[PDB]
Amino acid sequence: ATDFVQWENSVRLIGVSLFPVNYDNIEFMGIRLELFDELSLKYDPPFYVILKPSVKRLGIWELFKHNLPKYINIHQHWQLITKDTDTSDSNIMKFANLCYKDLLKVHSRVQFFRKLEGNYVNDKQYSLLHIDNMGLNVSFRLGADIIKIKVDDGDDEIIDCTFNGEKNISLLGSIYGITNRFQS
Amino acid sequence: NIEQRKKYLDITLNDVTVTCEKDMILLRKGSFTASFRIAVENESIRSMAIDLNAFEVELQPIIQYAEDTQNVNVAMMAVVQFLRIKELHEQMISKIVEASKFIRASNNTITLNDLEVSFHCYWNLPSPYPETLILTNKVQKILDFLIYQYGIQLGVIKYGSTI
C-alpha cells in the first residue's frame, strides 16, 4: 500500500499540487510549487502558499503565509481571482497556476543564460558574467566581446543592448532568439 | 493523513488521471494518453521519452523542447494545460455558435457569411501554458478591441454585427 507515495511523486512532477497541513487541529490548505532545474537535472525545493480557513465566513479560504519571491504579485493574483469572496477549489488552482506561470517565466529566463555557459556560439565560447535575480539585466562574454542586455519582464523582449559598450540593435527582440542574432 | 492527501491531489488533477505503470507515468483524459518515461540515475534525470496517442502535431513544439531539455516538468504541465485550454476552446466556440448567427465551420473555426473567426492555441516556448490567439480574416483590430472591451464571447458576437 506504498504505491501512493509513488503515485503522488508522479503527480508532483507536474509542478503544482495541493496538500493538507494539520496545525493546531486546523486543516490548512498548502499549495506546492516545484520547478525543475535543467542544469542540475533535479527539482528545486518547493515554494509554498498556505491557506487558512476563515473564522468569519463559511467556505472562505484566506492567505496565511507563503515564501514566494517578491517579484510574484501573489496578493494581486489572489484578489483578481477570488475577490475575497469565491475561494472555490477551482479558483485556488487558477490562483496556483497563475503564480506558477510567473515563477516559470523568471526561472526559465535565468536558466537560459546559465545553460549557455561553456557552450560555443558563432565559433565563440559563451561565458555568463552577471545576471540579476529576475534575469532582466544580463552581461555575458562571447569570444572576445562583452554583451549587456536589458529585458522587459512583461514580454521577455530585449529592449536595450550594448556591444562592447556601444549601442546595439541587431540583438534586440525576444530573449530566447538572441542565440540566432549573433550571426549579424 | 493518507486519504486526505489523495483528496487534495484528486482536486489538483481534476478530470485528469495519473498512473504509475512500470517505469512510465501515464496521463489519461477520456481515451487520451500521454506516456512519460524517465531514467533516474542517482537523484537526477538523465533521459526522458514521451509518447502520445493524439494531438501529436498540436503538442510537437513544447514536447520537442521538453525532450531536447529532458524537462519532464514542462512536459507534463504542457499536456495538462493543453487538455484544459482545448476544452475551454470547445466550450467557448460552442457558446458563440449557439448564441449567434455564427456557425461551426471546423474544429477551431466559426463563420458568418464571408467572415471567418479562428481560435488558436500556440506554445510560447519554453512556457508550458499555451496562449489563446483569436484571428479573423477581416478587421483584426476591431475584433481585438471588442474582445478587450467585452470579453471573448461578447466581443466575437458583437464583431459579427459590424459586418
Binding site: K94 | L133, I147, Y150
Partner: peptide, 24 residues
Amino acid sequence: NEIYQQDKIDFNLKLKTDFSKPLI
C-alpha cells in the same frame, strides 16, 4: 472590462493587436 480580465486568465489570451503600439 472584468469579463476580458477573467478570459485573459482562463484562456491565457493574447490579442493579435498590440494596443501598446501605434496603429499607424
